[PDB]
Amino acid sequence: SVKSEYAEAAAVGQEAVAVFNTMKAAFQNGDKEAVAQYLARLASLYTRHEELLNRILEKARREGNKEAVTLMNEFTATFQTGKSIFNAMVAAFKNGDDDSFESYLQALEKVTAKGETLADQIAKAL
Numbered sequence: 001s002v003k004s005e006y007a008e009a010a011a012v013g014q015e016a017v018a019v020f021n022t023m024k025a026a027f028q029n030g031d032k033e034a035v036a037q038y039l040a041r042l043a044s045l046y047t048r049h050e051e052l053l054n055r056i057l058e059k060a061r062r063e064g065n066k067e068a069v070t071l072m073n074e075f076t077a078t079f080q081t082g083k084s085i086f087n088a089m090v091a092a093f094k095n096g097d098d099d100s101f102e103s104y105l106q107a108l109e110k111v112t113a114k115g116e117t118l119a120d121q122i123a124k125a126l
């Protein structure tokens, strides 16, 4: 069901949380090579999370599950913020700008954290 599909999406999001915090440890240790690889992994995970989220929202719409559609619109809006800041983070890494990278790393955390009470609400609506 859409619910199992959201569980699969939730797991992929958690995988990105795991890799992100392991990437944040590398960065603070100055292990740039590991960071470069982790950032490639994270993008691949976020891109796959986005795809499971879009399919879930489209399916909620085809089902007419108005509340789930509302919440998923709100979720996908927060999700595009993460994308924007994530792409700037990667750009700061490319540029060698550690000050901007640190800042973007903190932003994503508050973007991910804030967007979590919604994520649990979607589970319960689908």
Ligand SMILES: OCc1cc(-c2ccccc2)on1
Pocket (backbone or CB within 6 Å): 043, 046, 047, 050, 078, 079, 080, 081, 082, 083, 084, 086, 087, 108, 111, 112
């Ligand atoms: O905070 C959620 C989030 C989403 C993304 C993202 C990154 C790159 C492409 C698409 C999405 O990064 N963080």
